[PDB]
Amino acid sequence: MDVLTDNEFYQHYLQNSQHMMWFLGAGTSRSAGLPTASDIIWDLKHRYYCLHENQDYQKHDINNHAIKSKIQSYMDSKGFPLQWSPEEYSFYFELVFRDDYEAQRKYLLEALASRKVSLNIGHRVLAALLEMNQTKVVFTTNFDDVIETAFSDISGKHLSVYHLEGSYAALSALNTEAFPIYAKIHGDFRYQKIKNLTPDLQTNDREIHKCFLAAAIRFGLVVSGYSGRDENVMTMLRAAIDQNNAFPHGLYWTVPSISKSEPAVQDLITYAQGKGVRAYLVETGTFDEMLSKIWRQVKDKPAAIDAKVRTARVCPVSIPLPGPGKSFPALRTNALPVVTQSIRCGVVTLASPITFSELKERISQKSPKALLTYTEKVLFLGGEPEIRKIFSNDEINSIGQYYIDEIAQSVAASTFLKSFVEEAILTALLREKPILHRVRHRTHYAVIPNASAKDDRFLDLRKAVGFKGDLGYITGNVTNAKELSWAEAVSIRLEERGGKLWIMLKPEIWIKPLDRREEATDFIRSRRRYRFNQCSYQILDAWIKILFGSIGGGGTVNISCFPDAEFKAEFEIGTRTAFSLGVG
Amino acid sequence: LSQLAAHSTIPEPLLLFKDNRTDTHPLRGLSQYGPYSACFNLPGQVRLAYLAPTEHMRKLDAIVRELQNPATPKEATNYYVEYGGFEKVFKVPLVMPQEHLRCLALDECHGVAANGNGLALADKIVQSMSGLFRQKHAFDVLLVYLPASWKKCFEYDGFDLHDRIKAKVAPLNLPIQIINDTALTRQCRANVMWGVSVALYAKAGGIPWKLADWDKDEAYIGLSYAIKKNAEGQEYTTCCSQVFDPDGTGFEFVAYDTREFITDRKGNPYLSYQEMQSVLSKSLHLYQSSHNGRMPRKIFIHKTTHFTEDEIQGAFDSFSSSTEIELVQIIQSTNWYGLKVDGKKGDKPVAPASYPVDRGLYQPLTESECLLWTQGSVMGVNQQNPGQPVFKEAALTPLPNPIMLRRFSGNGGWHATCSSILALTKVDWNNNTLYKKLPVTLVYSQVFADVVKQTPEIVNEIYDYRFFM
Ligand SMILES: NC(=O)c1ccc[n+]([C@@H]2O[C@H](COP(=O)([O-])OP(=O)(O)OC[C@H]3O[C@@H](n4cnc5c(N)ncnc54)[C@H](O)[C@@H]3O)[C@@H](O)[C@H]2O)c1
């Protein structure tokens, strides 16, 4: 009963944002660093419980929600004050400390001294809403300066405070309609003796009480972040309810969770409903959530206020910078650097647009010796007779070359272009060599041919794949299969990392049919079981010197894709694989 | 030239045990010293309960009896230490259940399991489980045995029988422990014994071990999502979150269901600005409640997928303006692998090493990406032959595979991030080995989101970690 969804308490506020006054509490300052009364009380309780060092310490181990309930029930067993009661604070303080005012002062100066008070989104939003005249009256029971600092930062001026000094001015300003007012209300008969308050200050407190009564005579209350611990505040609220036509636009009590509400607030809401007031117990999550969802729909936002409320654009400050190292234990990768940021490609324009699938099936049916691209316009790296020969149709307009500059970012952005570049690189690589070529799952491999698995070119591969210096076998068939021929292979991939192009190699073995992979995987595991660091080093070196010409020179080999053509591609892949060593 | 900057090594993190003693090996530290002690916390009498057919109750009783008797590795396991019984090590008695706590299902589940059914078996388990809820306040951890006939229908591409049973059991705050046929079999008693005893103590409420570097003031948040289909055919996303201290723990979550989310061409959802802001604000609210109003000075946010421009701004608007927020993306699969090449000394020139790369090596690549290993050679934890490194994964993969970290925020310093990830790797209580491939935040959040996804309704509650996992 008397429960609305958050959405229902967002259209009512949008229309009547001008007829609303806020009653804050200690929960609207918990996100800023300052602990609330519940946190202090729980700290005292678990210190008394002997859950931790009961003399002086910090860093509790477990709080949970079952341990907390166990502690609260154990307290309630002996007859300790009920939860959410004004008697609880002083009672627990006296029980835990048992005089020793010096220890009390050390506790309060250890729990609230090195607390970096800082703003959150909700406080900035509230300060902005105070700047542009949407919310007029704000009431609070806190002893902090979060809202004042927020208003000073957002606006640049100073807030008008009407606490115990200048209390009589609150009603006069309300009657004269001085809109921005921020009135504070003290606690329960204990803060009076803390500051040695004279009875004149008690008269001042009831002054802000009459202020509240008259404000409710003309506004609506959206009290948030309050628990009902004080009874003076509850009595003043009840008196305000007793006034005729109290809160014409309704009284809203926002809580983070209804299932974790307080009995006192339920009693107050029931009384308010009984008297005939539009009182609802809404659940809007935390304070920051509510204030941000409110700030979303605020209209006529000045540019400066909006810029000052939300966080500015986060620059890419994520720039750590490394340097070269000097120490002996090193690390060898599997990546070969590629240094060629320029290719020449041929183009052709089609009168009738074609799709990627149609081009692929035409290539599959009418296989040329040329490469093609498919994003929106076809770029090729083949020969002039062949481009005339493929799909013909005489829809060609121009064959003006298209230079490709800074291929790194283009490869990083697109996906088909990266595959095209990888295909061109591999075609240049495998040219004039007996190694095979397979394109399984867009993960181009290089399989050793079984017909010529006896050349001296693969002698090192056989040597580095055997056991104890003996020659091994780089090509054969699976044990329990006559149609599962296997051969040593390597997968070549192209990767982009921050403006550089790497070629990644990985040893693997290839299966001919490609459709019978279960026993193939079993055979892969049995073969690769004993391939540790020392064997992998030799295998990688053998594959590198098999593919990229020869090593020892330590330079940058050059490969050409279709060298005797008008549109060729040249690359300068290095022979040595990138390494690293450092610390020192 | 191809000199890839310089690498660095993080020393292996240390764990904290009873009476403030430190060791890198969890099992050995538990054996000599015992679990971490903090107050009493009341795992003073770990009482168990049974849920299994009376024809299969004997084996469960047998394993519970074996839990209180010593066991030996029986061979050169190279990692495991001799088990001394539950009275030893844990310093806490284990109580066998009496006749009053022997609830069971009679005959309904056998034919259903033979037919490969789903939700109905879980609901019948829930009804017997309610028969046990009539007596909940008699035990701490509950033992459930699902025979191989019920393993027949354990899962089918999604729905998992134990996972859905746990999903239906968790919201009512009672822990369970699943014991499958592997534990009774596999003939290596010592390996099983260390894997179940620790989990029972953790679910009872205790803390087995804890990181020894806890003086820093930081927090680690892990986010994961799961796509679920509610009624009337509408797509929903369950974004679960979990916050850690620099010493592990992290007993609570924020479970939140959302509708406003985009989706790329892989099924990965992306929260909007408001949804991310709400999730992180609820996470901060949870952290403040459990730590008596303390706010962390630095916050680490770990996610598997990248951060959209809206999600980065959503994160910065949830915490205060004086809190350093650093967002990290962790990728499991990478095209790079590394080999160690030492040598020189005086004997011979450089040559490949006999063992793979160290665990703590990390290699910066670019202005935003780094290669952290978290997998490889680790020294000082060998039990078969001391003084030799153990790869600990020579059976699965002969070579370790690194992981890539991308940073969408943060001021500087790869050392802090890599050290935090490596330390968080070692604090998973459901595995018996040294480490895992991923930090505990991601795996925990993922499994908890997977469990939450199976709820029929929309949940926006705050849960506990014992009742899940
Ligand atoms: N900041 C301060 O000055 C301060 C701090 C502690 C206590 N006090 C004193 O305690 C007395 C009683 O204060 P109280 O009534 O607020 O007691 P309280 O601290 O118990 O109120 C806390 C209530 O706010 C809710 N809350 C907590 N965090 C929230 C969040 N992030 N968003 C929304 N709601 C949240 C809590 O659930 C609870 O209902 C006052 O006199 C007050 O002066 C003041």
Residue numbers in the entry:
A (entry chain A): 1 to 584
B (entry chain B): 5 to 473
Question: What's in the article?
Answer:
Recently, short pAgos in conjunction with the associated TIR or Sir2 (SPARTA or SPARSA) were found to serve as antiviral systems to combat phage infections. The SPARSA antiphage defense system is encoded by an operon that consists of a short pAgo and an associated effector with an N-terminal Sir2 NADase fused to a C-terminal APAZ domain, which can form a stable heterodimeric complex in vivo and in vitro. In this study, we investigate the newly characterized SPARSA phage defense system from Geobacter sulfurreducens (GsSir2/pAgo) and describe the cryo-electron microscopy (cryo-EM) structures of NAD+-bound complexes of SPARSA in the absence or presence of gRNA and tDNA. Our results reveal that the APAZ (Analogue of PAZ) domain and the short pAgo form a featured architecture similar to the long pAgo to accommodate nucleic acids.
Finally, we obtained a three-dimensional reconstruction of SPARSA at an overall resolution of 3.6 Å. The overall structure of SPARSA contains GsSir2 and pAgo with a 1:1 stoichiometry, in which pAgo is closely enveloped by the individual Sir2 and APAZ domains, appearing as an armchair shape with dimensions of ~110 Å in length and ~70 Å in width. The N-terminal Sir2 domain and the C-terminal APAZ domain collectively form arms that wrap the short pAgo in the middle, which resembles the back of a chair. The pAgo protein is clamped tightly by the N-terminal and C-terminal Sir2 domains via extensive interaction areas with estimated buried interfaces of 1400 and 1500 Å2, respectively. In the cryo-EM density of SPARSA, a density within the crevice near the catalytic residues N142 and H186 was observed, which was compatible with the NAD+ molecule. As no external NAD+ molecules were introduced, the bound NAD+ may be an endogenous molecule that is trapped during protein purification; these results are consistent with the findings of the previous study, in which SPARSA was shown to bind NAD+ in vivo 21. Similar to the classic Sir2-like sirtuins, NAD+ was bound in the cleft between the Rossmann fold and the small domain34. The NAD+ molecule embraces α2 of the Sir2 domain, which causes the nicotinamide (NAM) ring to be almost parallel to the adenine ring. NAD+ is buried with surrounding surface interfaces of ~850 Å2 and engages in extensive hydrogen bonds and hydrophobic interactions. However, the activation of SPARSA NADase does not involve exposure of the active site for NAD+ hydrolysis, and apo SPARSA can bind NAD+.
